Write an enzyme that holds these catalytic residues in place. Structure first.
Site, PDB file in Angstrom:
ATOM      1  N   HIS A   2       0.804  -1.248   0.000  1.00  0.00           N
ATOM      2  CA  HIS A   2       0.000   0.000   0.000  1.00  0.00           C
ATOM      3  C   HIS A   2       0.842   1.307   0.000  1.00  0.00           C
ATOM      4  N   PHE A   4       0.348   4.300  -0.449  1.00  0.00           N
ATOM      5  CA  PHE A   4      -0.220   5.425   0.294  1.00  0.00           C
ATOM      6  C   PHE A   4      -0.534   5.091   1.736  1.00  0.00           C
ATOM      7  N   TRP A   5      -1.353   4.065   2.051  1.00  0.00           N
ATOM      8  CA  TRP A   5      -1.722   3.739   3.395  1.00  0.00           C
ATOM      9  C   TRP A   5      -0.598   3.354   4.323  1.00  0.00           C
ATOM     10  N   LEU A 159     -16.119  10.248  -0.650  1.00  0.00           N
ATOM     11  CA  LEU A 159     -14.910  10.260  -1.470  1.00  0.00           C
ATOM     12  C   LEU A 159     -15.310   9.714  -2.883  1.00  0.00           C
ATOM     13  N   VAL A 161     -13.873   9.767  -7.181  1.00  0.00           N
ATOM     14  CA  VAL A 161     -13.023  10.210  -8.305  1.00  0.00           C
ATOM     15  C   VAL A 161     -13.794   9.825  -9.526  1.00  0.00           C
ATOM     16  N   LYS A 168      -5.195   6.840 -11.014  1.00  0.00           N
ATOM     17  CA  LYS A 168      -4.065   7.751 -11.230  1.00  0.00           C
ATOM     18  C   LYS A 168      -3.612   8.391  -9.924  1.00  0.00           C
ATOM     19  N   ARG A 169      -3.947   7.731  -8.799  1.00  0.00           N
ATOM     20  CA  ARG A 169      -3.462   8.175  -7.471  1.00  0.00           C
ATOM     21  C   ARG A 169      -4.046   9.507  -7.052  1.00  0.00           C
ATOM     22  N   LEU A 170      -5.181   9.905  -7.589  1.00  0.00           N
ATOM     23  CA  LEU A 170      -5.915  11.087  -7.151  1.00  0.00           C
ATOM     24  C   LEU A 170      -6.517  10.954  -5.738  1.00  0.00           C
ATOM     25  N   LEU A 411     -23.927   8.101   6.487  1.00  0.00           N
ATOM     26  CA  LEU A 411     -25.029   8.283   5.497  1.00  0.00           C
ATOM     27  C   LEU A 411     -24.494   7.906   4.126  1.00  0.00           C
TER      28      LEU A 411
HETATM   29  C1  LIG Z   1      -7.580  14.094  10.778  1.00  0.00           C
HETATM   30  C2  LIG Z   1      -8.341  14.280   9.453  1.00  0.00           C
HETATM   31  C3  LIG Z   1      -8.002  13.052   8.501  1.00  0.00           C
HETATM   32  C4  LIG Z   1      -8.977  13.130   7.338  1.00  0.00           C
HETATM   33  C5  LIG Z   1      -8.730  11.918   6.360  1.00  0.00           C
HETATM   34  C6  LIG Z   1      -9.029  10.554   6.955  1.00  0.00           C
HETATM   35  C7  LIG Z   1      -8.821   9.390   5.932  1.00  0.00           C
HETATM   36  C8  LIG Z   1     -10.031   9.390   4.915  1.00  0.00           C
HETATM   37  C9  LIG Z   1      -9.868   8.122   3.979  1.00  0.00           C
HETATM   38  C10 LIG Z   1     -11.025   8.097   2.967  1.00  0.00           C
HETATM   39  C11 LIG Z   1     -12.286   7.441   3.530  1.00  0.00           C
HETATM   40  C12 LIG Z   1     -13.361   7.446   2.392  1.00  0.00           C
HETATM   41  C13 LIG Z   1     -14.675   6.949   2.956  1.00  0.00           C
HETATM   42  C14 LIG Z   1     -15.624   6.760   1.749  1.00  0.00           C
HETATM   43  O1  LIG Z   1     -16.163   7.748   1.231  1.00  0.00           O
HETATM   44  S1  LIG Z   1     -15.850   5.166   1.071  1.00  0.00           S
HETATM   45  C15 LIG Z   1     -16.629   5.477  -0.516  1.00  0.00           C
HETATM   46  C16 LIG Z   1     -15.534   5.496  -1.570  1.00  0.00           C
HETATM   47  N1  LIG Z   1     -16.105   5.880  -2.913  1.00  0.00           N
HETATM   48  C17 LIG Z   1     -16.477   4.971  -3.829  1.00  0.00           C
HETATM   49  O2  LIG Z   1     -16.223   3.777  -3.653  1.00  0.00           O
HETATM   50  C18 LIG Z   1     -17.009   5.576  -5.099  1.00  0.00           C
HETATM   51  C19 LIG Z   1     -16.440   4.878  -6.358  1.00  0.00           C
HETATM   52  N2  LIG Z   1     -15.031   4.720  -6.408  1.00  0.00           N
HETATM   53  C20 LIG Z   1     -14.220   5.768  -6.550  1.00  0.00           C
HETATM   54  O3  LIG Z   1     -14.745   6.909  -6.595  1.00  0.00           O
HETATM   55  C21 LIG Z   1     -12.751   5.602  -6.554  1.00  0.00           C
HETATM   56  O4  LIG Z   1     -12.458   4.231  -6.898  1.00  0.00           O
HETATM   57  C22 LIG Z   1     -12.043   5.863  -5.201  1.00  0.00           C
HETATM   58  C23 LIG Z   1     -12.129   7.362  -4.947  1.00  0.00           C
HETATM   59  C24 LIG Z   1     -12.645   5.034  -4.025  1.00  0.00           C
HETATM   60  C25 LIG Z   1     -10.583   5.513  -5.297  1.00  0.00           C
HETATM   61  O5  LIG Z   1      -9.912   6.159  -6.383  1.00  0.00           O
HETATM   62  P1  LIG Z   1      -9.161   5.273  -7.530  1.00  0.00           P
HETATM   63  O6  LIG Z   1      -9.851   3.899  -7.620  1.00  0.00           O
HETATM   64  O7  LIG Z   1      -9.077   6.208  -8.687  1.00  0.00           O
HETATM   65  O8  LIG Z   1      -7.744   4.959  -6.842  1.00  0.00           O
HETATM   66  P2  LIG Z   1      -6.439   5.943  -6.689  1.00  0.00           P
HETATM   67  O9  LIG Z   1      -5.370   5.477  -7.667  1.00  0.00           O
HETATM   68  O10 LIG Z   1      -6.820   7.328  -6.852  1.00  0.00           O
HETATM   69  O11 LIG Z   1      -5.838   5.628  -5.296  1.00  0.00           O
HETATM   70  C26 LIG Z   1      -5.502   4.349  -4.856  1.00  0.00           C
HETATM   71  C27 LIG Z   1      -5.325   4.359  -3.321  1.00  0.00           C
HETATM   72  O12 LIG Z   1      -6.614   4.669  -2.712  1.00  0.00           O
HETATM   73  C28 LIG Z   1      -6.878   3.713  -1.760  1.00  0.00           C
HETATM   74  N3  LIG Z   1      -8.342   3.557  -1.686  1.00  0.00           N
HETATM   75  C29 LIG Z   1      -9.198   2.943  -2.580  1.00  0.00           C
HETATM   76  N4  LIG Z   1     -10.490   3.066  -2.170  1.00  0.00           N
HETATM   77  C30 LIG Z   1     -10.416   3.722  -0.952  1.00  0.00           C
HETATM   78  C31 LIG Z   1     -11.414   4.134  -0.065  1.00  0.00           C
HETATM   79  N5  LIG Z   1     -12.698   3.815  -0.255  1.00  0.00           N
HETATM   80  N6  LIG Z   1     -11.059   4.778   1.087  1.00  0.00           N
HETATM   81  C32 LIG Z   1      -9.775   5.045   1.220  1.00  0.00           C
HETATM   82  N7  LIG Z   1      -8.737   4.680   0.426  1.00  0.00           N
HETATM   83  C33 LIG Z   1      -9.096   4.053  -0.712  1.00  0.00           C
HETATM   84  C34 LIG Z   1      -6.209   2.417  -2.293  1.00  0.00           C
HETATM   85  O13 LIG Z   1      -6.139   1.422  -1.288  1.00  0.00           O
HETATM   86  C35 LIG Z   1      -4.933   3.030  -2.796  1.00  0.00           C
HETATM   87  O14 LIG Z   1      -3.938   3.254  -1.751  1.00  0.00           O
HETATM   88  P3  LIG Z   1      -2.709   2.214  -1.536  1.00  0.00           P
HETATM   89  O15 LIG Z   1      -3.477   0.926  -1.280  1.00  0.00           O
HETATM   90  O16 LIG Z   1      -1.966   2.358  -2.832  1.00  0.00           O
HETATM   91  O17 LIG Z   1      -1.964   2.679  -0.296  1.00  0.00           O
HETATM   92  N1  LIG Z   2     -18.470   5.983   3.672  1.00  0.00           N
HETATM   93  C1  LIG Z   2     -19.492   4.930   3.393  1.00  0.00           C
HETATM   94  C2  LIG Z   2     -20.863   5.342   3.915  1.00  0.00           C
HETATM   95  C3  LIG Z   2     -21.586   4.073   4.380  1.00  0.00           C
HETATM   96  O1  LIG Z   2     -20.985   3.353   5.209  1.00  0.00           O
HETATM   97  N2  LIG Z   2     -22.821   3.704   4.045  1.00  0.00           N
HETATM   98  C4  LIG Z   2     -23.723   4.562   3.236  1.00  0.00           C
HETATM   99  C5  LIG Z   2     -24.825   3.634   2.795  1.00  0.00           C
HETATM  100  C6  LIG Z   2     -26.072   4.481   2.572  1.00  0.00           C
HETATM  101  O2  LIG Z   2     -26.492   5.262   3.689  1.00  0.00           O
HETATM  102  C7  LIG Z   2     -25.021   2.736   4.000  1.00  0.00           C
HETATM  103  C8  LIG Z   2     -25.693   1.418   3.689  1.00  0.00           C
HETATM  104  C9  LIG Z   2     -26.650   0.961   4.630  1.00  0.00           C
HETATM  105  C10 LIG Z   2     -27.350  -0.237   4.423  1.00  0.00           C
HETATM  106  C11 LIG Z   2     -26.947  -0.928   3.274  1.00  0.00           C
HETATM  107 CL1  LIG Z   2     -27.805  -2.454   2.944  1.00  0.00          CL
HETATM  108  C12 LIG Z   2     -26.028  -0.551   2.326  1.00  0.00           C
HETATM  109  C13 LIG Z   2     -25.360   0.664   2.544  1.00  0.00           C
HETATM  110  C14 LIG Z   2     -23.584   2.478   4.508  1.00  0.00           C
HETATM  111  C15 LIG Z   2     -19.457   4.700   1.842  1.00  0.00           C
HETATM  112  C16 LIG Z   2     -20.349   3.528   1.372  1.00  0.00           C
HETATM  113  C17 LIG Z   2     -21.505   3.784   0.592  1.00  0.00           C
HETATM  114  C18 LIG Z   2     -22.349   2.724   0.172  1.00  0.00           C
HETATM  115  C19 LIG Z   2     -21.915   1.442   0.545  1.00  0.00           C
HETATM  116 CL2  LIG Z   2     -22.912   0.036   0.033  1.00  0.00          CL
HETATM  117  C20 LIG Z   2     -20.826   1.210   1.360  1.00  0.00           C
HETATM  118  C21 LIG Z   2     -20.015   2.239   1.775  1.00  0.00           C
HETATM  119 MG   LIG Z   3      -7.172   8.330  -9.504  1.00  0.00          MG
END
Ligand SMILES: CCCCCCCCCCCCCC(=O)SCCNC(=O)CCNC(=O)[C@H](O)C(C)(C)COP(=O)(O)OP(=O)(O)OC[C@H]1O[C@@H](n2cnc3c(N)ncnc32)[C@H](O)[C@@H]1OP(=O)(O)O
Ligand SMILES: N[C@@H](CC(=O)N1C[C@H](CO)[C@@H](c2ccc(Cl)cc2)C1)Cc1ccc(Cl)cc1
Ligand SMILES: [Mg+2]
Length: 411
Positions: A2, A4-5, A159, A161, A168-170, A411
Site C-alpha cells: 500500500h 499510500f496507506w 470520497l 473520483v 491515477k493516485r488522485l 449516510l
Molecule cells: C484528521 C483528518 C483526517 C482526514 C482523512 C481521513 C482518511 C479518509 C480516507 C477516505 C475514507 C473514504 C470513505 C468513503 O467515502 S468510502 C466510498 C468510496 N467511494 C467509492 O467507492 C465511489 C467509487 N469509487 C471511486 O470513486 C474511486 O475508486 C475511489 C475514490 C474510491 C478511489 O480512487 P481510484 O480507484 O481512482 O484509486 P487511486 O489510484 O486514486 O488511489 C488508490 C489508493 O486509494 C486507496 N483507496 C481505494 N479506495 C479507498 C477508499 N474507499 N477509502 C480510502 N482509500 C481508498 C487504495 O487502497 C490506494 O492506496 P494504496 O493501497 O496504494 O496505499
Molecule cells: N463511507 C461509506 C458510507 C456508508 O458506510 N454507508 C452509506 C450507505 C447508505 O447510507 C449505507 C448502507 C446501509 C445499508 C446498506 Cl444495505 C447498504 C449501505 C452504509 C461509503 C459507502 C456507501 C455505500 C456502501 Cl454500500 C458502502 C459504503
Molecule cells: Mg485516480
C-alpha cells in the site's frame, strides 16, 4: 503493498491491531502552526475548489459527480443517487466547516473531477468496555480511561473520483488535502467507513435488506424468486404474501416527530447510545438537524403516550439508479437511521418503520448490523446482503470491537 496507506497514521495490520489495548492517538502530537498554510501542490490542469453548500449550482455539481460516479454494487447493476436535498442535509449539519469539503476541478472548464467531504462529529471513542475489564485485571484502569471524554473529530464520507480519472493516485491526494484542512482546525482524528478492505478496520459488519415491494425488486434483478419457491405452483403470489405488511402503524401513539419533541428524543437517544463503545453525542441542534422530518430525505416517528415521547425511529431515503433495466429507472430504498425503544420490544418498534416505509412507497429497507439491528433480523424477515461494511479511524489506535458496539450511522 500500500504505497499510500503505508505512509499514514493507521494500524498497518490485524496483528498490530490485535495488540492494541487502549484507545489513543497513533501519531506524533503536532500543532496547527506546524501544518503547511498552503494547499498541497497539484497538477497544472487541476485546481482545488471549496464548494459553497449554500449555492444550488455547487450542490448540483457534486450531485452529478456522485450520480454518475459514486458507489455501485459489485455487479454494476445499481448506483447510489443521493439527491441534492439529501447532500445539503448530509454536508451541512450545525457548525459544519465549509473548508472541510474538498474538491478538485479541471481548470479549463471547471468540471468537477473528485470530491471528499468532512463534517464535524462529537464522538465517544474511548477504550472499549471489554478492554476496560481486561485493564482492571492488569491493574491498568487510568491508562484505559485517558481518552474517555467525547472528542470533536471529523467524519469523512463521499470520497469520489470521476471514472475517467480512476487509478491515477488522485484519491491519496484528496485524502492528504482533507487531512491538511482538518489539521489546520486543530482536529487530528477522523472516522470513516468503506465497503472495501483497507488498513485496518476496528469493526466490520454485514448488510441487511427487507423486501417491501418484492415484485419490483425481482423485475430490476435486485432480488430473485429464491429456489424453494419453485416447488410452488405460483412463486410470486407467495412472495408478495410473505412480505405483506399492515397498512397503518400498529403502535397507537405513533406520529411524526415535531420540533417540540427535540429534547425528549435527544434524551432517549443519548441514553440508549451510551450503551455502545463508539457512538455520537448530539446537541439539541444536531438532533433537530438529523432527525426532524425533511421531505424526501429523512422520516422520523415518535411514540407518544400520556404526553411523553417514549420510543422513536428514523429512516432516510436514497434512491439508486438501475443501470441496466427497461421498465424501471430507480430503486427507492429506506435505510434504518437512529432509534430508541423504551416501552415496547425493538421488533415491534421497527415493524412500524417497515409499515411506514411501505405505505410511503419504498421498495426495500436496508441497514448494517450496528446498534441492536440483529435483534430484529429474523422476525422482521431481513436477509443478509453481499460483502461487509468496515469501520475505520484515522490516527486512532483502537481495539477490535463487534459491530453491535458501534452506534455511528454513516449516510
Ligand atoms: C484528521 C483528518 C483526517 C482526514 C482523512 C481521513 C482518511 C479518509 C480516507 C477516505 C475514507 C473514504 C470513505 C468513503 O467515502 S468510502 C466510498 C468510496 N467511494 C467509492 O467507492 C465511489 C467509487 N469509487 C471511486 O470513486 C474511486 O475508486 C475511489 C475514490 C474510491 C478511489 O480512487 P481510484 O480507484 O481512482 O484509486 P487511486 O489510484 O486514486 O488511489 C488508490 C489508493 O486509494 C486507496 N483507496 C481505494 N479506495 C479507498 C477508499 N474507499 N477509502 C480510502 N482509500 C481508498 C487504495 O487502497 C490506494 O492506496 P494504496 O493501497 O496504494 O496505499
Ligand atoms: N463511507 C461509506 C458510507 C456508508 O458506510 N454507508 C452509506 C450507505 C447508505 O447510507 C449505507 C448502507 C446501509 C445499508 C446498506 Cl444495505 C447498504 C449501505 C452504509 C461509503 C459507502 C456507501 C455505500 C456502501 Cl454500500 C458502502 C459504503
Ligand atoms: Mg485516480
Amino acid at each position: 503493498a500500500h504505497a499510500f496507506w503505508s505512509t499514514q497514521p493507521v494500524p498497518q495490520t490485524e496483528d498490530e491491531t490485535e495488540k492494541i489495548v487502549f484507545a489513543g492517538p497513533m501519531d506524533e502530537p503536532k500543532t496547527v502552526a506546524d501544518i503547511p498554510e498552503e494547499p498541497y501542490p497539484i497538477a497544472s490542469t487541476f485546481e482545488w475548489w471549496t464548494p459553497n453548500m449554500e449555492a444550488a449550482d455547487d450542490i448540483h455539481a457534486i450531485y452529478e459527480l456522485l450520480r454518475d460516479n459514486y458507489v455501485e454494487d459489485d455487479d454494476s447493476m445499481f448506483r447510489f443517487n443521493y439527491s441534492e436535498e439529501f447532500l445539503q442535509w448530509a454536508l451541512c449539519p450545525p457548525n459544519y466547516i465549509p473548508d472541510w469539503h474538498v474538491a478538485v476541478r479541471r481548470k479549463a472548464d471547471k468540471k468537477l473531477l473528485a470530491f471528499i467531504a468532512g463534517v464535524p462529529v462529537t464522538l465517544r471513542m474511548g477504550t472499549p468496555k471489554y478492554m476496560k475489564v481486561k485493564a482492571q485485571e492488569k491493574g491498568e484502569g487510568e491508562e484505559a480511561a485517558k481518552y474517555d471524554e467525547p472528542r470533536h473529530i471529523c467524519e469523512i464520507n463521499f470520497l469520489c473520483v470521476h471514472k475517467q480519472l480512476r487509478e491515477k493516485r488522485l484519491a491519496p491526494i484528496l485524502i492528504k488535502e482533507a487531512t491538511r484542512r482538518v489539521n489546520r482546525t486543530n482536529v487530528w482524528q477522523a472516522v470513516y467507513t468503506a465497503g472495501v478492505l483497507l488498513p485496518t478496520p476496528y469493526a466490520s459488519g454485514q448488510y441487511f435488506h427487507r423486501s417491501l415491494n418484492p415484485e419490483k425488486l425481482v423485475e430490476i434483478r435486485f432480488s430473485g424468486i429464491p429456489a424453494q419457491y419453485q416447488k410452488f405452483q405460483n412463486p410470486m403470489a407467495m412472495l408478495k404474501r410473505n412480505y405483506q405488511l399492515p397498512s397503518a402503524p400498529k403502535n397507537s401513539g405513533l406520529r411524526e416527530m415535531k420540533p417540540s419533541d427535540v429534547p425528549q428524543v435527544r434524551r432517549i437517544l443519548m441514553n440508549y447510545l451510551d450503551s455502545f463503545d463508539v457512538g455520537p453525542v448530539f446537541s439539541d441542534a444536531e438532533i433537530s438537524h438529523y432527525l426532524l422530518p425533511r421531505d424526501g430525505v429523512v422520516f422520523t416517528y415518535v411514540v407518544e403516550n400520556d404526553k411523553k415521547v417514549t420510543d422513536f425511529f428514523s429512516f432516510y431515503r436514497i434512491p439508486s439508479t438501475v443501470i441496466g433495466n427497461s421498465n424501471y429507472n430507480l430503486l427507492n430504498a429506506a435505510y434504518v437511521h437512529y432509534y430508541a425503544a423504551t416501552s415496547i420490544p425493538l421488533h415491534q418498534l421497527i415493524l412500524d418503520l417497515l409499515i411506514v416505509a411501505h405505505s410511503r412507497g419504498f421498495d426495500v429497507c436496508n441497514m448494517v448490523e450496528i446498534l441492536d439491528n440483529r435483534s430484529f433480523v429474523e422476525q422482521l424477515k431481513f436477509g443478509a446482503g453481499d460483502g461487509h461494511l468496515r469501520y475505520y479511524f484515522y490516527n486512532w489506535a483502537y481495539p477490535k470491537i463487534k459491530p453491535s458496539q458501534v452506534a455511528l450511522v454513516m449516510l
